[PDB]
Structures are given as C-alpha cells and as structure tokens.
Amino acid sequence: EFARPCIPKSFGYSSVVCVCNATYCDSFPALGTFSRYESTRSGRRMELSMGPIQANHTGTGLLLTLQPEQKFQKVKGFGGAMTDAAALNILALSPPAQNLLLKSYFSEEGIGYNIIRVPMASCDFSIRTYTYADTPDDFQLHNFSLPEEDTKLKIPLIHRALQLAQRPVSLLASPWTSPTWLKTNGAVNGKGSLKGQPGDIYHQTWARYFVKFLDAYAEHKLQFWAVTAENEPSAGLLSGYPFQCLGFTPEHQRDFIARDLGPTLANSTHHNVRLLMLDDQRLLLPHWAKVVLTDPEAAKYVHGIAVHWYLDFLAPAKATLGETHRLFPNTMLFASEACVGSKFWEQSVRLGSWDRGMQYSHSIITNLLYHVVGWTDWNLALNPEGGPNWVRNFVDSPIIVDITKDTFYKQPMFYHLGHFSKFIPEGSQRVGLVASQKNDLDAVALMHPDGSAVVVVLNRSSKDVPLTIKDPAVGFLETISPGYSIHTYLWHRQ
Ligand SMILES: *[C@@H]1O[C@H](CO)[C@@H](O[C@@H]2O[C@H](CO)[C@@H](O[C@@H]3O[C@H](CO)[C@@H](O)[C@H](O)[C@@H]3O)[C@H](O)[C@H]2NC(C)=O)[C@H](O[C@@H]2O[C@@H](C)[C@@H](O)[C@@H](O)[C@@H]2O)[C@H]1NC(C)=O
Ligand SMILES: *[C@H]1[C@H](O)[C@H](O)[C@@H](O)[C@H](O)[C@H]1O
C-alpha cells in the first residue's frame, strides 16, 4: 500500500501515540547507499531517509566498527502474547479496525512479528478462571476440552494473524496452572505444586495434558514451534501468590522433564515441538540451567531456556545470560515475557510514554548482546486501564484499544519493538561491534540471511551524538544519533 503517516496525539506524557481507527492506520537501498529508519521523542515514527556509504573517514569522533567475521547467535524472532485479554480487546473493535491492528503487527506493511505466545488456559489476563480439565479426578482426561476463549476468541485471531503475515509465524505455548485436583493446595493460585513426585500418576497426567492441548490446537489446524515447561515456576513457591501459578524448584522441574514431560512429547505425534525450560527471571541463571542440564536424562529433551525481564535490575546480563551461554552454549536463550507498568507503584498505562519505549529497546539490545535469540512482549493489546485482568494486575501494552470509540493507539513501545522486529528476520545472525571510545549509545549489529547488514542504535541520553559506522568490507556511514532517538541502519554489503 502507500505509506500513511502517524496521526499523533498527546496525553500529557513525554511523547505521542499514533491514532488508528476503522479506516486509517499508519503504515510503511540502492548500492552503495544506506537506509536509516528513525524514531524520536519529538514525534518521528520509523521515518525513512538515505545516505551514501563513503570510502574514507577522518576525525576523532565516535566510530562504531562492525566485525562481520565475529559471529554469534542466530535470531529466532519477535512477537507478543495472544492472551484472553488481548483477544477480547481486539474483537471489541469493528472488523476493519481489527484488520488494521493485526496488520500493524503481523504484516509487511506493519512491523513483521513472527512469534505468538499462547497461554494454555487462563492466566491473570483472563476474565474467568478455568483449565481445560476442570472435572475433578479426571486422570484419563476424558473431559479435556477447549472452551470458547480458545475456539471463538484466540484460535480465530491467530488464524487471521497467520493469513496477514509474510513471514512464517512460530507459536509458543505456556501453562500458568494445572487443574486444581492435581495440586497440593487445591486452588489455581497461592503456594502449591503438583501432588506426588515426578514419575507418578499426577505428573503423568499433567504431561498428557500438554499432548491433549497440542492435539486440540492441531484439530484447529494450528501447530506449535515450542512449549515452556511452566510459566514462572518460581511463583507457585510463594505464599499467597495472587494469580494462576504452579510451583517447581529447579530439581522438581529437572525430574518432571526427565521422567514425564520430555518422554510424553517425544512419544506423541508432536515430537518435533521444542521444549523450553525455566520461563522465569534471569537471576535464576545460571543455577537453574546447571540443575536441569547437567542431568543427561533431562538435558536430552531441553531445546532452550526462556527468560523474563522483571528482576533484570538485580541481575547483570553478563553474570546471568553470559555465564549460561559460556556453560551451555548449545542451549538457546530466549526472552519470553516483558511488560512495563507491572510494579505496584507504577501507573499501569502511560499513553505516549517515550521512557517506556526506551525500556523495551534497551532490554532488546542488551539481550541480543548476551546471546538471546528472541524477544517476546506480553499482551498484544489492552484497554486504557491495562486490563481486563481478574486480579487487577493491570500493566501497559504497545497497543491500547478504546472500544467506545472504535480506535486504538500505537505507543512508543510499538515502534521501539518494530525497529528490531521489522528489520531482523528469523535466521539473522549477530556479529561483532566495537566502539572507539566510551559513549552513551546502545547498539547492536547483525547480518541478514542474504548477508546484508542491520545496526540498531539507541541514544538513551539527551545529547545529540555524531558518529560514524565502519563496515571493513564496504565503507563508512557518517550519521548523528539525536538525544532520545532510536535508529535502525540497513545496507547491502554485497
Ligand atoms: C479515522 O481517522 C482519520 C484520520 O484521522 C479521520 O479522518 C481525518 O479527518 C480529519 C479531521 O476530521 C481530516 O483532517 C481535517 O482536514 C479538514 C479539511 O480537509 C480541516 O478542516 C481540519 O482542520 C483537519 O485537519 C482528514 O480529512 C482525515 N485525515 C486523514 C489524514 O484522512 C477519520 O474521520 C472520518 O473521516 C474523515 C475524512 C473526517 O471527515 C471525519 O470527520 C470522519 O468522520 C477517522 N474516522 C472516524 C470514524 O473518526
Ligand atoms: C509475567 C508478568 O508477571 C506479567 O505481569 C504477568 O501478567 C504474567 O501473568 C506473568 O507470567
């Protein structure tokens, strides 16, 4: 289509949102030039410009030098979660407005997401508590079934998303709680775990539940890339935990995967589905990786390690991600859940917040710089309150839906995310990037599967920083990174 620009609107915070409705939504180099996409606090939204690649460079300004031969992880991708709350919000819009929201995310005219996390039954971003097997003591799982949250809300929206998408989309599933008749405390929330011990009928049934969920989704012609072994297993170890959870120590998780979940999936028609362990705060690394992955019976089933961002302030990426990679380089690290406005003192939704967009890109760049292969936002959309949410655990979302007005707002988080998701396709590989002097920039460089280069530069300071990027193959890009800007640079080195 033609590029339609952002309709900006201010809500009194540091930047603007882009206004989208039933009929309007904003949407989207020759050798040897580069493309630059820029977003700024002042209001630019992924604006395209071009520049020449020079042969020479002189000066003592900041130089960032690509090391195309230092090769690191391959990227799996970027996306968000299709919760009950996200489905209810999107379906609240008229169908044309719904198409423009899905296109914003999934289409090539939008920012190209290729990952969708799907909860297995209810979480806090549900308006009802339920599992797929609520009939008590149904150990055979005869009464297992998907309710309308799945069959009328989530499943059809995931289908629209795959139809709009240019890139292959990977589905990732995670459970919050099991049926309560499987749990020590008999409740969806609170402190409690599976009854018994791995290897027994409870653990066997819980592993069969995963296969039943996959069978059920496959009947609706949806197939999964990966499942996690539990969302935030540490939560269910905490007294009074307020919403759906299921606690595992790392030993409990090791032995569940070894004796029940890994063999159950390996013996099912879904043996190709990857299993991710942890799915919890990175400060749990490297300890959890060492407990699970040094048992060869558990390690043979574990494809990767899922991390969440909520305690990153306590957990230096080098001592957590870097050290895990050093010990277990062949087990991919993947960021599976992030959102702002989740601390009890923070405002849930701050329409137009630039700070919250910068938190997203700063996290993404730091994760890429420490071997992480992908990054998943939480709810795809929320209402202006940051809900619905059965326990009022409201948070922020890159897209806020205003149903009484059939309109949605794209926040700075949406664009900060798009500066990566749009321009780093599955298969791209991170390469070296070194700075000539101390600076306030955050930057990462990658190579696309066709060998072209992509560099994202975030300026977290208020000062404009002139800089040059050196590609030792090709030449020099002379540029400036304005204070509170994010830029993505692209060029063919072919
Ligand atoms: C969906 O969102 C679009 C984009 O904002 C709305 O269309 C826009 O309406 C604007 C104001 O209503 C128009 O801009 C104005 O231009 C006029 C003269 O041309 C000036 O008097 C004024 O100062 C404004 O700047 C503009 O035509 C249009 N914007 C774009 C870029 O398309 C739209 O509103 C619905 O259609 C438009 C064309 C208006 O006439 C509305 O009143 C109309 O109901 C939004 N749709 C809905 C349902 O609100
Ligand atoms: C991750 C975060 O705690 C988020 O706020 C919460 O809503 C999810 O349920 C949890 O898994």
Exposure string of 259-274, with b = 16+ CB inside 10 Å and e = fewer, is bbbbbbbeebebeebb
Tell me the ligand closest to 230's alpha carbon. Answer: 2
Nearest protein Cα to ligand 1, atom 8: 24
* DSSP letter, residue 252: H
Closest residue CA from atom 1 of ligand 2: 337
H-helix or E-strand spanning residue 470 = strand 465-471
Please identify, by atom number, the ligand 1 atom nearest to the C-alpha of residue 4.
31
Here the tokens at position 128 are 């009802």
Contacts of 220 (CB under 8 A, 6+ apart): 146, 151, 155
10 near 352, Cβ under 8 Å? yes
> Does CATH place domain 32-74+429-494 in 3.40.50.11900?
no
Q: Of 432, 420, 428, 423, whose CA–CA distance to 449 is shortest?
A: 428
Report the nearest atom of ligand 1 relative to the CA of 23.
1
DSSP 75-120: P-EEEEE--HHHHHHHHTS-HHHHHHHHHHHHSTTTT---EEEEEE
**Active site includes 337?**
yes
Tell me the two tokens of residue 175: 């459970």
Q: 209-246 b/e with 16+ CB inside 10 Å = b?
A: bbbbbbebbeeeebebbbbbbbbbbbbbbeeebebbbb
Residue 158 tokens, joined: 């995931």
Q: Which of 268, 132, 278 is nearest to 206 (CA)?
A: 132
Distance CA 341, CA 384 (A): 12
User: What are the start and end residues of each CATH 2.60.40.1180 domain in the chain?
Assistant: 32-74+429-494
Compute the distance between CA of residue 43 and CA of residue 41 in angstroms, rounded to an integer: 5
C-alpha to C-alpha distance for 276 and 266, rounded to whole angstroms: 14
Catalytic residue among 109, 149, 230, 232: 232
Token representation of residue 335: 């960021």
Which residue's CA is minimally distant from atom 8 of ligand 2? Answer: 124
> Solved how?
X-ray
Q: If DSSP codes are grouped into helix, strand and coil, which group holds residue 216? A: helix
**232 an active-site residue?**
yes
Which ligand places an atom closest to the C-alpha of 235?
Answer: 2
Q: Which residues pair with 38 in a beta bridge?
A: 47, 487
User: Which part of the chain has CATH 3.20.20.80?
Assistant: 7-28+75-428
For residue 402 and ligand 1, the question of a CB distance below 6 A is answered with no
The helix (H) or strand (E) run that includes residue 491 is strand 485-491
Residue 454: closest CA among 424, 418, 416: 424
What kind and span of H or E run contains 308? strand 304-308
21 lines ligand 1 (CB under 6 A): yes
**Amino acid letter for position 195:** K
Q: How far is the CA of 315 from the centre of ligand 2 (A)?
A: 18
Q: Which fold has domain 7-28+75-428?
A: TIM Barrel (3.20.20)
Region of 279 please: left (phi>0), alpha (psi -120 to 50) or beta. left
